[PDB]
Amino acid sequence: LAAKKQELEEILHEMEARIEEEEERSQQLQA
Amino acid sequence: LAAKKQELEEILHEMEARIEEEEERSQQLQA
Amino acid sequence: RIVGLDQMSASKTKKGMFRTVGQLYKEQLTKLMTTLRNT
Amino acid sequence: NPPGVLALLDEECWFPKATDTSFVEKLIQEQGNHAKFQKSKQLKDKTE
């Protein structure tokens, strides 16, 4: 269960990366 | 835990594919 | 390591995405301050 | 306000082009106005 917890913060980090990569893709599309 | 694990592999694969496709899209179509 | 060009100069990766060089020690000490704010 | 030592390192690390001497000179120039940083300029070997 503790391993599952730390994988949950890994998932949260990945969703933050999702948002950041969407922003980066939009910015590059602007250029 | 099993469902969240499966979600973990799904998000990993989606993150890899998305970051790839966006990096080619940026570094090629940005011109 | 954090994403960056030719990491062991002119790297142009994302700003404010991953952890920072340091200052995690500073925020840990501030959290210690907060812990000591009641006793 | 004019950033402190830790903050100045925080900006300096992320610069593409940087060096120790430029950082030291920039720190001295930005914090030379403040009187809380005693100095003795006979030692120009980045010891201040």
According to the 3-state scheme, what is the secondary structure of chain D?
A: CCCCHHHHHHHHHHCCCCCHHHHHHHHHHHHCCCCCCCCCCCCCCCCC
- Written as one letter, the residue type at C1 is R
Chain C residues in contact with D16 (beta carbon < 8 A) = 9-12
DSSP annotation of B13 reads H
User: Nearest CA of chain A to the CA of B18: how many Å?
Assistant: 8
CB atoms within 10 A of CB D28: 14
With tokens 């995690």, the residue in question is C24
Closest CB from B7, B11, B30 relative to A28 = B30
Q: Which residues of C touch A20 (CB under 8 A)?
A: 14, 17
Residues 1-31 of A with CB under 8 A from B: 1, 4, 7-8, 10-11, 14-15, 17-18, 21, 24-25, 28-29, 31
Question: Which residues are CB-contacts of C30 (< 8 A; sequence separation ≥ 6)?
Answer: none
Q: Does C14 touch chain A (CB under 8 A)?
A: yes
Vertex C13 angle, CA C10 and A11, to 5°: 155
User: What approach was used to elucidate this structure?
Assistant: cryo-EM
Are the C-beta atoms of residues D10 and C20 closer than 8 Å to each other?
yes
